[PDB]
Amino acid sequence: AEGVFQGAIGIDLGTTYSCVATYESSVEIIANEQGNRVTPSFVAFTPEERLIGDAAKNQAALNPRNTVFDAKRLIGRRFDDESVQKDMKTWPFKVIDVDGNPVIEVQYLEETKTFSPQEISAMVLTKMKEIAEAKIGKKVEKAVITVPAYFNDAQRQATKDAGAISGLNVLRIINEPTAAAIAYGLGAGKSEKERHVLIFDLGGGTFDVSLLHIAGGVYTVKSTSGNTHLGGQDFDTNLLEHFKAEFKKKTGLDISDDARALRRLRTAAERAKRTLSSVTQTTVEVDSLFDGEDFESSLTRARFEDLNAALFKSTLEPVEQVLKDAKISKSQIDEVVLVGGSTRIPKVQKLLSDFFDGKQLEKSINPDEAVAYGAAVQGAILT
Ligand SMILES: [Cl-]
Ligand SMILES: [Cl-]
Ligand SMILES: [Cl-]
Ligand SMILES: [Cl-]
Ligand SMILES: [Mg+2]
Ligand SMILES: [Mg+2]
């Protein structure tokens, strides 16, 4: 027990970003060595070393064949699965078929090596463990890891297996939406007074809606829906195209083939989106965007909303589906919990609060951190 943490860390092993939390005297989300409270679920292999997290994502463009990401899209799946065959056409790294399983093949230290999805995820989980250890000052042996509610038994086992590989005793695999509810203490009393709770989780690349029944300490997923491939980055993309159009119109320049110019302009758009969650108008500037020309525009909240009209509206569909499927009316819903950074967008909150006739949404916990937070809460209950 000497020099070992007696608790269990909570890990949100996300598709694109991961987050780790612990609950000593209170629940804390842990920052990594670059001071970030989420860490890219990225592993890069180079002629000299392996990078995990921020450094891996930051060199992805320079090292695309050997920078691995989206392993959560493979884990516990089969090579000839339909999502897989499809996902593979979109990745710059090689995925091969070994005994019918997907396996990632890369160059590492000037040799060809292959990794299962569980092995890649284990490397991310090891990174999360190490991040937690650095802040705790102790070794971590126990964890609670979260997975999407639609994960099947193979996907769940493969995720536990990843944990084992990373030197963690995985006490429980819990559902992402359930973690978020636990974060808000919903059902914490373990009282027999029941609740129905809708989790609205709009991630950067994922949109998941889940209906929970909670009573007596038992969290039951009644129904689940979403858009796997719609997310916050899609809002950025619409603003990016709007800005590209403006720039080309004023200057005659097309930045489509300049990766750096595209990157800087998407950064401007991401920043502009965030500003517009707090205020209603902003300038948008990029100095010397292309061929000597400065980019300057402005954007109102109203215009931002119009540019994403259809997308925003589409977010109510899965809320309706989940109720329809569970045979539960919107009036029976006790809490609506917001997860994912994109839920900070005022319009998204408004469409949702209006659908529930002015109901206030649970949002006091950072939406990017809520899943990890509840995983940490569950970890403390188990230890
Ligand atoms: Cl995810
Ligand atoms: Cl993610
Ligand atoms: Cl630059
Ligand atoms: Cl700039
Ligand atoms: Mg998430
Ligand atoms: Mg300037």
Domain that holds residue 379: 1-68+124-188+363-383
245 plus 200 within the same structural domain: no
209 plus 358 within the same structural domain: yes
143 plus 30 within the same structural domain: yes
334 plus 351 within the same structural domain: yes
Count of domains for the chain: 4
22 plus 146 within the same structural domain: yes
If we measure between CA atoms, which residue out of 69, 170, 168 comes closest to residue 121? Answer: 69
Residue of 70, 201, 236, 369 marked active site: 201
> Which residues are part of a known binding site for ATP?
15-17, 72, 204-206, 270-277, 341
17 plus 159 within the same structural domain: yes
Contacts of 357 (CB under 8 A, 6+ apart): 330
244 plus 305 within the same structural domain: yes
Using the mean position of ligand 4's atoms as its centre, give its distance from the Cα of residue 282 in Å.
15
Using the mean position of ligand 2's atoms as its centre, give its distance from the Cα of residue 297 in Å.
30
52 plus 178 within the same structural domain: yes
139 plus 58 within the same structural domain: yes
Using the mean position of ligand 6's atoms as its centre, give its distance from the Cα of residue 245 in Å.
20
26 plus 139 within the same structural domain: yes
> Which residues are part of a known binding site?
15-17, 72, 204-206, 270-277, 341
133 plus 170 within the same structural domain: yes
129 plus 52 within the same structural domain: yes
Q: One-letter amino acid identity for 278?
A: S
Reply yes or no on whether 49 is catalytic. no
- Using the 3D structure, point to which of 314, 332, 351 is the last residue of a domain: 314
* CATH number (domain holding residue 256): 3.90.640.10
Using the mean position of ligand 3's atoms as its centre, give its distance from the Cα of residue 264 in Å.
7
Question: What is the number of the ligand closest to the CA of 339?
Answer: 5
* CATH number (domain holding residue 358): 3.30.420.40
Q: What does this entry list as its resolution, in Å?
A: 1.9
Using the mean position of ligand 4's atoms as its centre, give its distance from the Cα of residue 174 in Å.
42
Residues bordering ligand 2, an ion, CB closer than 5 Å: 14-17, 203
